[PDB]
Paper text:
Species D (HAdV-D) are the most diverse species and cause both gastrointestinal tract infections and epidemic keratoconjunctivitis (EKC). Each protein forms key interactions to promote cell infection, with the terminal domain of the fiber, the fiber knob protein, interacting with the viruses’ primary cell entry receptor. The adenovirus fiber knob protein is known to have a highly conserved trimeric structure. Sialic acid (SA) usage has been proposed as a major mechanism of cell infection for EKC causing HAdV-D. Here, we provide apo state crystal structures for fiber knob proteins of 7 previously undetermined HAdV-D, and provide crystal structures of HAdV-D25, HAdV-D29 and HAdV-D53 knob proteins bound to SA.
We performed X-ray crystallography to generate structures of species D human adenovirus fiber knob proteins HAdV-D15, D24, D29, D30, D32 and D53 in their apo states. These structures show the expected trimeric form, all viewed down towards the apical domain of the fiber knob proteins ([Fig fig1]). HAdV-D15, D24 and D32 were crystallised in only their apo states, whereas HAdV-D25, D29, D30 and D53 crystals were also soaked with sialic acid. Adenovirus fiber knob proteins crystallised readily, under widely varying pH conditions. The achieved resolution is mostly very high, up to 1.37-1.6Å, although some species gave diffraction to a more modest resolution. Pseudotyped viruses comprising an HAdV-C5 core viral vector psedutoyped with the fiber knob proteins of several HAdV-D of interest (D26, D15, D24, D29 and D53) were generated expressing a luciferase transgene under the control of a ubiquitous CMV IE promoter for measuring transduction following cell treatment with and without neuraminidase treatment. Non-significant changes in transduction were observed when cells were transduced with viruses with the fiber-knob proteins of HAdV-D15, D24 and D29 ([Fig fig3]). There was an overall trend in reduction, although in BT-20 cells there was a small, non-significant, increase in transduction of HAdV-D29 fiber-knob protein virus following treatment with neuraminidase. These results indicate significant usage of sialic acid by HAdV-D53 fiber-knob proteins, and the potential partial usage across the other species D adenovirus fiber-knob proteins.
Residue numbers in the entry:
A (entry chain A), C (entry chain B): 178 to 367
B (entry chain C): 179 to 367
C-alpha cells in the first residue's frame, strides 16, 4: 500500500537533541497523491529541555530545538539525522517479513517546489515558499507558545530534507518541552 | 476517501445552553492513517448568539465547549453536545442508515492519544492529544478566539473529540460564528 | 489523472497584482473525496510589493494584496481573475503546458457549505464559515507577520470563487512580499 510513512503513533525515544534517545519525535506522513499530509509533535524526556528553565539557562541556545530529517536520493533517512532509524518505516497492513524501506521518493518534498538556495538572493526566487511558520503550545497550554518553522530541502548536505525548528521567546521555568500536535502539508517530489 | 459528517449545511444540531441553539458543521475524511477534519460553529439562539461581555462578563460567558463522546463502536453517545440529527456517512455508490465497525476507523487513536493515569509520567506527552490555534469570530481578524481540540481526554467515553473555544477580548454584540478550522489526527485503524 | 489541480509547483509569473506578470502564485488543490486540500504561497517579483516600503508608501492600499480566482459553472477560471490560466491545469504524467481543462466542478468550493449571502444578514446563516483566517510570514520570518483571509464563493458575479486576501499592519522597510506556505482545506461542491 505504502501511503503512510511514520514513526508509529507512540515511538519509544528515537531522537537526539543533546544525547541519544533524549526525546520522542512522533511524525506521520500520509501521501494524498501530489501532497503529503503531515503531523509532528516532540516530547523531550531527558536533559535540560525535559525541564526548560530559562532563568537557570538564559542563552539563545537554551531557547530552541532543531530536528533535522535528511534523506538520500531514494528517500531513505540518512545517518546524521536528529531522528534515529528505530521508528521510521511504512505502516504495515499485513504481518509478513518486516524490512527497512528502500524507496520513498513519493514522500520527499518536491525539488522544484522547494529548490536548494544559492546565497546571492534574487527577487525572482522565493525565500519563504519552502517554510511553514506558526506556533505550537508547550504542554498544550495557551500561555506557553513556541514558534515552529518547518523547512523543506534547505539542508545542502542531503538530496531532500525536512527540518522542524522550535524556538520560544518567553522565559519558561520548569516546563518540559512537549509540543502540541502540528498539522501541515507539502508538495510531493512524485 | 470515506467521509463521516454533519453534511455541509446541517439544521441546528447542537446544545450549548438549550436544545438546537447552535449549528456545528463537522467533516471527517479518512486519508490512509489520518482523519482530515474541518469544524465551524454558529450559535443561533441564547447569550452566545449575541456575545456581550459587558452585560455577561464572567469567565463562563467567554468560552464554549463542544464535546463529541463515542462508545467502543465509534457511535456518538447521547450526552454529546452535538445531537445525532446530522451525523452519517456521505452518500456513496451504495447507501446505509447505521454506522458501527466502520465508525472505529474515524475515531482518534488510543495509541496516539492514550488516557493519562494519576500523577503524570514525564515520559508520556501531555500535549500531543491537543491542537491549539485561533479562529476568528465572524471571520474578522480583530475578533480572535482560541480553539483547543482535545482527543480521547473524556474519562467516561472510549473516544472523544472536544472543541474548546475561549476568547480574551470583551466582545459587544458579536454572534459566536467561528471561521472554518482545518485539522487532522491519527485514526484508531 | 484528475486528483490535483495546480499552478505547477514552480510557476513562471502568473499573476497581475498591479502589472501583468508581477507575481508568482503557487497554488495546489488536491481532492480527498469530500474535501479539497490546498497550499498557497505568493511571491511578488515586480513593483512596490516586490520591495515593500511603508515609510515611502504608507497608505492602506500599500499594505494589502488581493488575489481573486473566479470560476464559471464548469469550474474554469474566468477572465478578470488575478491569475492567468495558461499553466493552471490538472497534474498528469504530461509535465508540459497542455489543452485547458473543461470541467473541475469537483474542485470548486461547495455552494451548500459556502452559499452567497442575501442583503439582510440573518443570525441563522453563518458569515464566518466561508472564511479561513490566519497569519503567514513574509520571508518565512516570525517578525514579519501578514494576515491571510481565504474566502469561498463570496464574489457576486461568478459561480464559484477562491479569494486570497493578504494584509499587514507593520511598517515594513524594504521587505519583498514573499509569503510562507499556507495549508488549508475546504468542502468540495461534489
Amino acid at each position: 500500500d505504502k501511503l503512510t510513512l511514520w514513526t508509529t503513533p507512540d515511538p519509544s525515544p528515537n531522537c537526539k537533541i543533546i544525547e541519544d534517545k533524549d526525546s520522542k519525535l512522533t511524525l506521520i506522513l500520509t501521501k494524498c497523491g501530489s501532497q503529503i499530509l503531515g503531523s509532528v509533535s516532540l516530547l523531550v524526556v531527558k536533559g535540560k529541555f525535559s525541564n526548560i528553565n530559562n532563568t537557570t539557562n538564559p542563552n539563545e541556545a537554551d531557547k530552541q530545538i532543531t530536528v533535522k530529517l535528511l534523506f538520500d536520493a531514494n528517500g531513505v533517512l540518512k545517518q546524521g539525522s536528529t531522528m534515529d532509524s528505530s521508528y521510521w518505516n511504512y505502516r504495515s497492513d499485513n504481518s509478513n517479513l518486516s524490512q527497512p524501506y528502500k524507496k520513498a521518493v513519493g514522500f520527499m518534498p518536491s525539488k522544484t517546489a522547494y529548490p536548494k538556495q544559492t546565497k546571492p538572493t534574487n527577487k525572482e526566487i522565493s525565500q519563504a515558499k519552502n517554510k511553514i511558520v506558526s506556533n505550537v503550545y508547550l504542554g498544550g497550554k495557551i500561555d506557553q507558545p513556541c514558534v515552529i518553522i518547518i523547512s523543506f530541502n534547505e539542508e545542502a548536505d542531503s538530496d531532500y530534507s525536512i527540518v522542524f525548528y522550535f524556538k520560544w521567546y518567553k522565559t519558561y521555568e520548569n516546563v518540559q518541552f512537549d509540543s502540541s500536535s502540528f498539522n501541515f502539508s507539502y508538495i510531493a517530489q512524485e
